Amino acid sequence: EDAGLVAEAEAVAAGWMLDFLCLSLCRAFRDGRSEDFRRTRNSAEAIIHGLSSLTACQLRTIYICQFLTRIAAGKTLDAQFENDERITPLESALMIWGSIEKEHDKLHEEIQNLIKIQAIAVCMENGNFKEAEEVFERIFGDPNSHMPFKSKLLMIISQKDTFHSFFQHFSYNHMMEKIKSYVNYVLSEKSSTFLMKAAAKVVESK
Amino acid sequence: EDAGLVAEAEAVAAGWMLDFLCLSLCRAFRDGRSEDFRRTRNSAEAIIHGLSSLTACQLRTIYICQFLTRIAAGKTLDAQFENDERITPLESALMIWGSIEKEHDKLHEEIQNLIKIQAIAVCMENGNFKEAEEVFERIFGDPNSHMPFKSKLLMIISQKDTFHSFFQHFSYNHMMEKIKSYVNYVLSEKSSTFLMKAAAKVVESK
Amino acid sequence: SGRDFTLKPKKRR
Amino acid sequence: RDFTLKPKKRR
């Protein structure tokens, strides 16, 4: 009855708010507005938590929001994003990057390999050399690891050289620019969604 | 500039989300759906926290959301809604009831007096006869003496009558159904707001 | 602003 | 749902 049509109407509005808050999250991430990213993240958290069921399109949207929240906290090692207490922020986004149903194109591999490197490099910008070895074993012992730098990374750990020039080439800045390139691709995919296109027309004529 | 037109568009969609989350909170409060009320409250608080500046109409919407939260936790005495640790939830809901821009009609006066009476009755049915005496003075005491049963409540506190028949006539449920009578008014007043409106149209044809 | 308004309370008042 | 965006302070 009315209660059933209300529950359906609140589900349609919740899907509109998720696509909007996803676009606002990608935009604050691209621009680098940290405070707006923190507030848009909290809004996206509760809107997602209020969704009963999920479509395949909404599932990808949640993964994209998850991917940005952990890249934004990639250098914060003690920030636990998963129930699994051993997953560092960067290897959590590494699992999400492989979970997003997307094109495994050239840019996908570059982001993936840069995340694997920086997941260890972040652990060595601090004095967490033990955590770096345990991150290497989780990402790379056998055999899902066709990265040639598997040998160089395993050697850099036992060097204690924090300012290693290998990490200055495959740096956090290069990882951010590759991700922000994909963020721009997502930012234009759903820039024509309902809630944003409606609010844009209100301001465009104003 | 494209960045300024985006910020205004997000502030517009944030106002659409705040109104919708107010309908969902009011409807979940009336229907007694406790878990849907908990999730909608978290979504409303995150959107409110994301607002940079408030209008007079939005402040009225926030106070409606705040009022429903303290009333829902009226019997939870160990809940602290204000920085002042001595303010009980029903005392906090009373201050908001006098701040919402609305009619001060017969229904408003009946709800206010029921909040004052039940703010003491809730403390009575917990053994907190000391706090019930403190709540009595912050509400009544001798500010201007604008209440008839102001003297009858004082003796009941001295009676230490945990479950008095006077509290059952001006009951917690009579306060509830009169608030829901006003919630049904807000449910009809805001039923034509944008987000819930377009969501209803989508469900109507389906 | 919006950050000044809370909907959730605290435990053990 | 069963998805998380905010972290806890001890990993």
Author numbering:
A (entry chain B), B (entry chain A): 62 to 267
C (entry chain E): 285 to 297
D (entry chain F): 287 to 297
What text comes from the article?
PIN2/TRF1-interacting telomerase inhibitor 1 (PinX1) functions as a telomerase inhibitor and tumor suppressor. We determined the crystal structure of the TRFH (TRF homology) domain of TRF1 in complex with a short TRF1-binding motif of PinX1 and revealed that PinX1 bound to TRF1 via the F-X-L-X-P motif, providing a structural basis of how PinX1 is recruited to the telomeric region by TRF1. We demonstrated that PinX1 is directly associated with and inhibits telomerase activity by TID (telomerase inhibitory domain) with crucial lysine residues clustered in PinX1292-301.
We have reported the crystal structure of the telomeric TIN2-TRF1 complex previously, revealing that the short TBM (TRFH-binding motif) of TIN2 directly binds to the TRFH of TRF1.2 Notably, an 11-residue fragment of PinX1 (R287-D-F-T-L-K-P-K-K-R-R297), referred to as PinX1TBM, closely resembles TIN2TBM, indicating that it may bind to TRF1TRFH in the same fashion as TIN2TBM does. To provide direct and independent evidence of the PinX1-TRF1 interaction, we purified a high-quality TRF1TRFH-PinX1TBM complex and determined its crystal structure at a resolution of 2.7 Å. The structure showed that TRF1TRFH formed homodimers, with each TRF1TRFH interacting with one PinX1TBM peptide. The electron density map demonstrates that the PinX1TBM peptide assumes a well-defined conformation. Similar to the TIN2TBM-TRF1TRFH interface, hydrophobic contacts are essential for the interaction between PinX1TBM and TRF1TRFH. L291 of PinX1 was deeply buried in a pocket formed by L86, R102, C126, and T130 of TRF1, supporting previous findings that the L291E mutation in PinX1 disrupts its ability to be bound and recruited by TRF1.2,3 The aromatic side-chain of F289 of PinX1 packed against a hydrophobic surface of TRF1 and the proline ring of PinX1 P293 stacked with TRF1 F142. Notably, except for R297 of PinX1 that is engaged in electrostatic interactions with E146 and E192 of TRF1, all other basic residues in PinX1TBM (K292, K294, K295, R296, and K299) extended outward from the interface and did not contribute to the interaction with TRF1. PinX1MUT (A292-P-L-G-R-R-G-V-Q-S301) almost completely abolished PinX1 RTI in the TRAP assay, although the TRFH binding capability was unaffected, suggesting that lysine residues in PinX1292-301 are essential for the telomerase inhibitory activity of PinX1. As a natural suppressor of telomerase, PinX1 represents a potential strategy for curtailing cancer progression by targeting telomerase. This study reported the crystal structure of the TRF1TRFH-PinX1TBM complex and confirmed that PinX1 was recruited to the telomere by TRF1 predominantly via the binding to the F-X-L-X-P motif, highlighting its tumor-suppressive impact on CESC.
